[PDB]
């Protein structure tokens, strides 16, 4: 019975670790996307500002 | 005692599955928001470029 309990513990730990890996991937992807959006937003803000200053 | 161990394992599994469902919700919402931001940023970039070209 103790072996069964230890095997259930290993199951839970394996599933949890896989979930954590997926969540880490999602965090990194969200960070990447936010960074790209920040870059483009600020670039286009500077581009509207330049247009105003050159009109 | 072994029954306390097995019920604890079931509790752990149920709480884990609940958390995973909530995390899936959060992931879908994040993707939706990033998609809307992408669409609007590109729309406004194209609008600014069309303005520049029309002048």
């Amino acid at each position: 019975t103790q072996n069964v309990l230890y095997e259930n513990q290993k199951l839970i730990a394996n599933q949890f670790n896989s979930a954590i890996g997926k969540i880490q991937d999602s965090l990194s992807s969200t960070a990447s996307a936010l960074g790209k959006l920040q870059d483009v937003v600020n670039h286009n803000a500077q581009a509207l500002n330049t247009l105003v200053k050159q009109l | 005692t072994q029954n306390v161990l097995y019920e604890n394992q079931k509790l752990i599994a149920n709480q884990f599955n609940s958390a995973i469902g909530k995390i899936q919700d959060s992931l879908s919402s994040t993707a939706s928001a990033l998609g809307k931001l992408q669409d609007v940023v590109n729309h406004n970039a194209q609008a600014l470029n069309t303005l520049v070209k029309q002048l």
Binding site: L37, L51 | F16, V52
Partner: peptide, 28 residues
Amino acid sequence: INASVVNIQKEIDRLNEVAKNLNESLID
């Protein structure tokens, strides 16, 4: 004075894929 477009479709697709794949991490 050119405006740039953003392309984060990779990140969006991966987020949706994980939102689907987490079903596989559920404990039976």
